[PDB]
């Protein structure tokens, strides 16, 4: 089993919506 079950921070678990957000925001890659 994994170390922590309520893990929001994992790659393959996350769904289509903020996958698209991930694509955009990794393309952006900065904050002011």
């Amino acid at each position: 089993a994994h170390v922590w079950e309520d893990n929001w921070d994992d790659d393959n678990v996350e769904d289509d919506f903020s996958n698209q957000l991930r694509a955009e925001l990794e393309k952006h890659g900065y904050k002011m």
Binding site: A1, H2, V3, W4, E5, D6, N7, W8, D9, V13, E14, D15, D16, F17, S18, Q20, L21, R22, E24, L25, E26, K27, H28, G29, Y30, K31, M32
Partner: protein
């Protein structure tokens, strides 16, 4: 079209070239998985049997592989006797290759013909023919028929015993012949005869290559026919103790692992003791590792209670010494399994002398922490994750050692080389998620590691940044320091991805640090790229800002509280507008919008209630005393327009609680934490309802005391514990103040205001289903009446009946059983008179159980009414343990209703 594909593939079959014949033959399985129609399946299979009876042996191998691929459609075959007659009729050929291929196909047809005596006989004869390739094909065919039959199995066990004693055929063919005895789990006497045969086999052939397959078939036989598990275990322990072959001992390892994983409760105390003695007496680190893995699995299971069940000290028990010495052994994996055994036994059993074992286990635990922290190997990280599992399990099972283990993990956070830090950050996040004091105990050092991050890491900076920001929020569950968040912003603006800082922001929204959340959402809002993304980030920003305003609250000041409520409600209004802007036909934020709307309505109800609480003193008792006599009040005992508004608020709050129950039962897809959180919000609403009902309204009729268990720390969140403590406080205060005053509500308004202030002082917890959603399950639910392509109503003669033929197919976005597995579908259909008792007579529901992911059900409706009717259906998906879970489309169909002219004329004559 399906028929068209069928006979064009038939023409490809009738083509001259065997290449094109192979083309069509291997093209059938696509047609099977496209058209599941059974007549088509039967005709295609019949043409297959024809071409297999007359093909040129490569077509035969192609047809064989087609059957072996599309095996699952075999059960819907009608003309079984003709199919089997062709396929069996080609077995009399003199070509050994053709005989072998045919026997393999019979092994494939085992699913539909398990009783064919002639097939049994042909397999048994070709089993002792001489042609090699058909001998091994006969072995494979026996291996399938013995799985799906019984009398064939007893025939084959007699024949196999005869052959093995009869000493013909070489050792390789003996290896092929042994694994037939796995399918002897049909009866106990067959199992015993095969067991005697296998014991004789191992004693007759002391060879490694013999013994390995013999033992593995013997143990699968016992694990299937679980009657001789103790004999199996003691035989394996004998061979692990006695036989000096290292490979055979590794077989014993990988087999006792299987038995320990399958049937743990059958493990006995003498078995455990014998394995422990073997693990002490072994010289080899690898075999000791395997035995320790076996003991780790058994310790995780129930059998530790068997080993420490009395009717010999626990210290006198040989397990403890082995566990201690192997936990302090030099080798890393051995130490990992030792600390696994120690953690399991410590959490499981509670005897008086085990405190020394607790101390030894925790100290050897930071030994594993330092070793895996500065090892940096893949196996080292595996043992590290094992140690962190030991941490989570030990701390949750026993809260006694929590502060010690947290401070040790912080010392390792000092002493780590920036690879294991993410892992132990997750682990200590879990531990502080259980017990809150672990963060505000040592806020400083985690911030020090945070400031050394930037020049400490170069490869997984994003990952460790996200983890340590999560735990800094968990540590500063209280109001976050401006200097600390400025340092956080400094490092994030130094080096971060937008997706990274977004994940820090999401963790901030999860824990409740809404000021930091507001800042991060503001930055991400100012960048974004796309429109629904912008509106989504903007809505999140507004809820974070409103929650910041709500946390900006002062105790026992009602005017400032309602001002803060109004400000926060303005900001939720902006946020919910932007959320409706973010809403799209794809990925529709239904749960998010509905949940934030219910939170809005809860806060509006709170503001209205505290407004009426303040207006309690607006001469309502004077209005009552002016309208009627104060003594023996006609409207109520100490009557009040304020009491009327209390009744209105009570009914409104109960309706709000009903809406929360509706939201939860329509959601159904979230995990345990989110569903629990929604239950707590409904708990708060019902708490306010019961408080205003049992204190302002009739307390003698209330007569309710919370004479039940409450306040246990079995919760899954510190947030949940905080709301639960608030609930206990409100219950004790209302139970104290139930009978003290008259209904004039002197300090009753003060008690209600205190409850409101506490319930708003506990901030919020934005949650996972409000964020990333998983196990997206749906019901298509296509009805099939007379097809109404437009909204034109469907005419029925109204004298006979009407049939519906509803159909549903269930779909899953991922692994369907993440949290809840669908079990049954309660469909619910009712009628309504479209032209205005609302046609609520037919109130049908039916519990169809989807055996496969498609289902259909026939409904009959009776009606004799002139007007149009609307027909409504519901899915009512009910899960494994049994819950309502109202999801589904809830579609509606219009139906017309006309009558016979002869019937109308007869009614006119009537």
């Amino acid at each position: 079209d399906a028929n068209s594909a069928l006979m064009e593939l038939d023409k490809g079959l009738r083509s001259g070239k065997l290449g094109e014949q192979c083309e069509a033959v291997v093209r059938f399985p696509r047609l099977f998985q496209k058209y599941p129609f059974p007549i088509l399946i039967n005709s295609a299979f019949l043409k297959l049997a024809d071409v297999f009876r007359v093909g040129n042996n490569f077509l035969r191998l192609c047809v064989l592989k087609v059957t072996q691929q599309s095996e699952k459609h075999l059960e819907k075959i009608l003309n079984v006797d003709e199919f089997v007659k062709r396929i069996f009729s080609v077995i009399h050929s003199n070509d050994p290759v053709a005989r072998a291929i045919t026997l393999r196909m019979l092994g494939s047809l085992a699913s539909i013909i398990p009783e064919r005596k002639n097939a049994h006989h042909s397999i048994r004869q070709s089993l002792d023919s001489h042609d090699n390739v058909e001998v091994e094909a006969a072995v494979f065919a026996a291996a399938n028929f013995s799985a799906q039959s019984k009398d064939f199995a007893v025939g084959i066990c007699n024949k196999i015993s005869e052959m093995i004693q009869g000493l013909a055929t070489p050792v390789d063919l003996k290896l092929k012949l042994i694994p037939i005895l796995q399918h002897m789990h049909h009866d106990a006497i067959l199992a015993s005869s095969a067991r005697q045969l296998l014991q004789q086999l191992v004693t007759s052939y002391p060879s490694t290559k013999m013994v390995i397959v013999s033992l593995h078939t013997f143990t699968l036989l016992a694990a299937s026919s679980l009657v001789d598990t103790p004999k199996q275990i003691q035989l394996l322990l004998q061979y692990l103790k006695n036989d000096p072959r290292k490979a055979v001992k590794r077989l014993a390892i990988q087999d006792l692992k299987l038995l320990a994983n399958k049937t743990p409760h059958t493990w006995s105390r003498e078995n455990i003791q014998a394995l422990c003695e073997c693990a002490l007496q072994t010289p080899y680190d690898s075999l000791k590792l395997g035995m320790l893995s076996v003991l780790s699995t058994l310790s995780g299971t129930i059998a530790i209670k068997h080993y420490f069940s009395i009717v010999s000290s626990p210290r006198s028990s040989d397990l403890v010494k082995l566990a201690q010495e192997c936990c302090y052994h030099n080798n890393r994996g051995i130490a990992a399994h030792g600390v696994r055994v120690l953690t399991n036994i410590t959490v499981s059993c509670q005897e008086k002398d085990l405190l020394a074992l607790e101390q030894d286990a925790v100290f050897g635990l930071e030994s594993l922490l330092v070793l895996c922290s500065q090892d940096d190997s893949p196996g080292a990280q595996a043992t590290l994750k094992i140690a962190l599992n030991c941490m989570v399990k030990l701390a949750k099972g026993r809260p006694h050692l929590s502060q010690s283990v947290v401070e040790t993990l912080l010392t390792q956070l000092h002493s780590a080389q920036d690879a294991a830090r993410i892992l132990m950050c997750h682990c200590l996040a879990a531990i502080a998620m259980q017990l809150p004091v672990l963060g505000d105990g040592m806020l400083g050092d985690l911030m020090e590691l945070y400031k050394v991050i930037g020049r400490s890491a170069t490869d997984k900076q994003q990952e460790l940044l996200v983890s340590l920001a999560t735990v800094i929020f968990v540590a500063s569950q209280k109001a976050l320091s401006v200097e600390s968040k400025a340092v956080i912003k400094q490092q994030l603006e130094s080096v971060s991805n937008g997706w990274t800082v977004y994940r820090i922001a999401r963790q901030a929204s999860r824990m409740g640090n809404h000021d930091m959340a507001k800042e991060l959402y503001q930055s991400l809002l100012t960048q974004v790229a796309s429109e629904h993304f912008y509106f989504w980030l903007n809505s999140l920003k507004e809820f974070s800002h409103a929650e910041q305003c709500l946390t900006g609250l002062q105790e026992e000041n009602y005017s400032s509280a309602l001002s803060c409520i109004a400000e926060s409600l303005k900001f939720y209004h902006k946020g919910i507008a932007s959320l409706t802007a973010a809403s799209t036909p794809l990925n529709p934020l239904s749960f998010q919008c509905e949940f934030v709307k219910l939170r809005i309505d809860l806060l509006q109800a709170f503001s209205q209630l505290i407004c009426t609480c303040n207006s309690l003193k607006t001469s309502p008792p004077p209005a009552i005393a002016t309208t009627i006599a104060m003594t023996l009040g006609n409207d109520l005992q100490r009557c009040g327009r304020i009491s009327n508004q209390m009744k209105q608020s009570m009914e409104e709050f109960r309706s709000l609680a009903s809406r929360y129950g509706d939201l939860y039962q329509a959601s159904f897809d979230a995990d345990s934490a989110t569903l629990r959180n929604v239950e707590l919000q409904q708990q708060s609403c019902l708490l306010i309802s019961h408080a205003i009902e049992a204190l302002i309204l009739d307390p003698e009729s209330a007569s309710f005391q919370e004479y039940g268990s409450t306040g246990t720390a079995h919760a899954d969140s510190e947030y949940e514990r905080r709301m639960m403590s608030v609930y206990n406080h409100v219950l004790e205060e209302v139970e104290s103040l139930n009978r003290k005053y008259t209904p004039v509500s002197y300090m009753h308004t003060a008690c209600l205001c205190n409850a409101i202030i506490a319930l708003l002082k506990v901030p919020l917890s934005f949650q996972r289903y409000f964020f990333q959603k998983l196990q997206s399950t749906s019901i298509k639910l296509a009805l099939s009446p007379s097809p109404r392509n437009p909204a034109e109503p469907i005419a029925v003669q109204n004298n006979q009946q009407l049939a519906l033929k509803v159909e549903g197919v269930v779909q899953h976005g991922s692994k369907p059983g993440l949290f809840r597995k669908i079990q049954s579908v309660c469909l619910n259909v009712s009628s309504t008179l479209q032209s205005k008792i609302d046609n609520m007579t037919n109130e049908m529901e039916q519990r169809v159980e989807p055996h496969n992911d498609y289902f259909s059900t026939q409904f009959l409706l009776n009606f004799a009414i002139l007007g149009t009717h609307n027909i409504t259906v519901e899915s009512s998906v009910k899960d494994a343990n049994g819950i309502v879970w109202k999801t589904g489309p809830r579609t509606t169909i219009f139906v017309k209703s006309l009558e016979d002219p002869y019937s109308q004329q007869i009614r006119l004559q009537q």
